[PDB]
Amino acid sequence: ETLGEKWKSRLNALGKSEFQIYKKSGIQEVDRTLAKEGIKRGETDHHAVSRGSAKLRWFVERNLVTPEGKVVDLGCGRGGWSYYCGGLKNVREVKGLTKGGPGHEEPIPMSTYGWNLVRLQSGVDVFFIPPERCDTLLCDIGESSPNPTVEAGRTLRVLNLVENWLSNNTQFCVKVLNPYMPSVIEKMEALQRKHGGALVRNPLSRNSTHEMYWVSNASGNIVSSVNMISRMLINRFTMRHKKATYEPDVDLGSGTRNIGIE
Ligand SMILES: Nc1ncnc2c1ncn2[C@@H]1O[C@H](CSCC[C@H](N)C(=O)O)[C@@H](O)[C@H]1O
Ligand SMILES: NC(=O)c1ncn([C@@H]2O[C@H](COP(=O)(O)O)[C@@H](O)[C@H]2O)n1
């Protein structure tokens, strides 16, 4: 029921080569080369396990999401979001959960700052476990599909999932894979009405996804928000100068935290 649908078809209609070029046109990138080589080498200090750490950092260093207390990371994969939160000031406990298993990102043990406050377990399907009480809820789940109706389903599953974990003034950051499909817009509107927050586009996301994140400390008419991104993604189809701007990767430190305010 929208304009992002025009974008998706155009996207799908791209040639393999055209596609790769577009996917990174004028986006923001994280310089991960050395971080990956160090990880591959067994290093467990400083490195982010994925570009997700840098991704979360962007929202956090802007107070769009303020992870505190018990943080639950739904679909932590390797744990970029979890290890990152494990080094943040007022965070006490970090629990990350994923499916893992062959053909899936499995959590990677690390000794980055606060790693001791972080527990990651795979072999978990978040959709069928009971909700635990938590102060901040993070969720980065959402598999992309060439078929926008398939994505719309996946998106809703996630929204319903999180609604079940959100309480009082729970802090949250949740990926909304396909925010432009009308059932997803409809649900988002309900949620926003019920828990506030807004949808925000992360400059680090690639042009090949219309993904937006529902963050707790931000507002803005949903529909308006998605169209903005839709127009933007379309504008980017036709670009002179398609370079990606890079930035150093995040450094996650290497110690253990003792907690206890003091
Ligand atoms: N039902 C489910 N239960 C648990 N994990 C799931 C799931 N469906 C998908 N996932 C997982 O969710 C992950 C999302 S990608 C993880 C990104 C992470 N924030 C990064 O920074 O490291 C995938 O690795 C996938 O295996
Ligand atoms: N035109 C192509 O050659 C091509 N390849 C992938 N895509 C679009 O982008 C989406 C996911 O992006 P990616 O495959 O992980 O980069 C797909 O689901 C599809 O809609 N398009």
Swiss-Prot record:
Annotated site residue numbers, mRNA cap binding: K8, L11, N12, L14, F19, K23, S144, R206, S208
Signal peptide positions on this chain: none
Top-level taxonomic group: Viruses
Annotated membrane topology: Peripheral membrane protein
Chain span(s) of sequence motif SUMO-interacting motif: 71-74
UniProt feature coiled coil, ranges: none
Chain positions with Phosphoserine modification: S50
Site feature (Essential for 2'-O-methyltransferase and N-7 methyltransferase activity) residues: D140
Residues the record marks as site: Essential for 2'-O-methyltransferase activity: K55, K175, E211
Catalytic residue list: K55 (for 2'-o-mtase activity), D140 (for 2'-o-mtase activity), K175 (for 2'-o-mtase activity), E211 (for 2'-o-mtase activity)
Segments forming domain mRNA cap 0-1 NS5-type MT: 1-258
PTM text: Sumoylation of RNA-directed RNA polymerase NS5 increases NS5 protein stability allowing proper viral RNA replication. Phosphorylated on serines residues. This phosphorylation may trigger NS5 nuclear localization.
Cellular localisation: Host endoplasmic reticulum membrane; Host nucleus
Binding site for S-adenosyl-L-methionine: S50, G80, W81, T98, K99, D125, V126, I141, Y213
Subunit structure: Homodimer. Interacts with host STAT2; this interaction inhibits the phosphorylation of the latter, and, when all viral proteins are present (polyprotein), targets STAT2 for degradation. Interacts with serine protease NS3. Interacts with host PAF1 complex; the interaction may prevent the recruitment of the PAF1 complex to interferon-responsive genes, and thus reduces the immune response.
Job of this protein: Replicates the viral (+) and (-) RNA genome, and performs the capping of genomes in the cytoplasm. Besides its role in RNA genome replication, also prevents the establishment of cellular antiviral state by blocking the interferon-alpha/beta (IFN-alpha/beta) signaling pathway. Inhibits host TYK2 and STAT2 phosphorylation, thereby preventing activation of JAK-STAT signaling pathway. May reduce immune responses by preventing the recruitment of the host PAF1 complex to interferon-responsive genes.
Protein name: RNA-directed RNA polymerase NS5
Annotated organism of origin: Dengue virus type 2 (strain Puerto Rico/PR159-S1/1969)
Full protein: residues contained: 2495 to 2756 of 3388
